[PDB]
């Protein structure tokens, strides 16, 4: 069946004196965004962001919009509480984030579930892998943890992660089976760039690949490098595929000694390129 994930990334940011916090939730299947909710609209609604979601009927959008609106109120409260727990100066913008969702392996049994939270960009509380206990990041989040233990909330999240989360991931993969599920293998090449009288930069490119995960490295004679290698962050092309490059500075006349290596799910055998 090969692995997949459903994930939501949710952010609220306070703007004191200038209105209610701005709240945005975005949903992904694997590396593909498919839904959003943004509180900055006259009439905010949960909305499709992938073609294959557009034929979900109105009851889907209604239910999801109700859940997102409840979350919006939860985030407003949490921003206020966290500020009190951490004894911060009033005024000032703060952020609360949540990331949650499910991964499946080669069956419809949940491989891993997530329910993690962050305040001001740093861990606050997260549900452990057992889906039974909580890791509190500090003594402020310990207050929250005791509240959530007494409520039995781990059971609530466990039920979602094992049930409805995986059910709907399954449905999304069917709706977008065409585009999700594909593997676009990287097209690779090396470019050559004079640097000085003594050396040159060789740059090894991987273009148009999906999914985003890839390994791209240079070697000097079968061994990984004893020198600096520039490796840029994997980056979106905009059209649903990804790009990456790795550059080495090498002495003139020794260009043939260096090999670029590309590993990706969509490649029968790893690629080896040489200038």
């Amino acid at each position: 069946m090969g692995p997949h994930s459903l994930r939501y990334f949710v952010t609220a940011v306070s703007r004191p004196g200038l209105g209610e916090p701005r709240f945005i939730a975005v949903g992904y299947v694997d590396d593909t965004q498919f839904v959003r909710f943004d509180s900055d609209a006259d009439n905010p609604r949960f909305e499709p962001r992938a073609p294959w979601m557009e034929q979900e009927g109105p009851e889907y959008w209604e239910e999801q919009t109700q859940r997102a609106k409840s979350d919006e109120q939860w985030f407003r409260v949490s921003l206020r509480t966290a500020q009190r727990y951490y004894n911060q100066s009033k005024g000032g913008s703060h952020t609360f984030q949540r990331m949650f969702g499910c991964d499946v392996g080669s069956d419809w049994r949940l491989l891993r579930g997530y329910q993690q939270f962050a305040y001001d960009g740093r861990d606050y509380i997260a549900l452990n892998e057992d889906l039974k206990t909580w890791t509190a990041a500090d003594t402020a989040a310990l207050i929250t943890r005791r509240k959530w233990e007494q409520a039995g909330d781990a059971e609530y999240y466990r039920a979602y992660l094992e049930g409805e989360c995986v059910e709907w991931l399954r449905r999304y993969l069917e709706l977008g089976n065409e585009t999700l599920l594909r593997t676009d293998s990287p097209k690779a090449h090396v470019t050559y760039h004079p640097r000085s009288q003594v050396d040159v930069t060789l740059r090894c490119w991987a273009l148009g690949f999906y999914p985003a995960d890839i390994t791209l490295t240079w070697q000097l004679n079968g061994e990984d490098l004893t020198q600096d290698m520039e490796l840029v962050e994997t980056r979106p092309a905009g059209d649903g595929t990804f790009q990456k490059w790795a550059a080495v500075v090498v002495p003139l006349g020794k260009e043939q000694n260096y090999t670029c290596h590309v590993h990706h799910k969509g490649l029968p055998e790893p690629l080896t390129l040489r200038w």
């Binding site: 839904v35 509480t81 959530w148």
Partner: peptide, 9 residues
Amino acid sequence: KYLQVASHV
């Protein structure tokens, strides 16, 4: 499918 947070912080 989106799930709302159960309890307050």
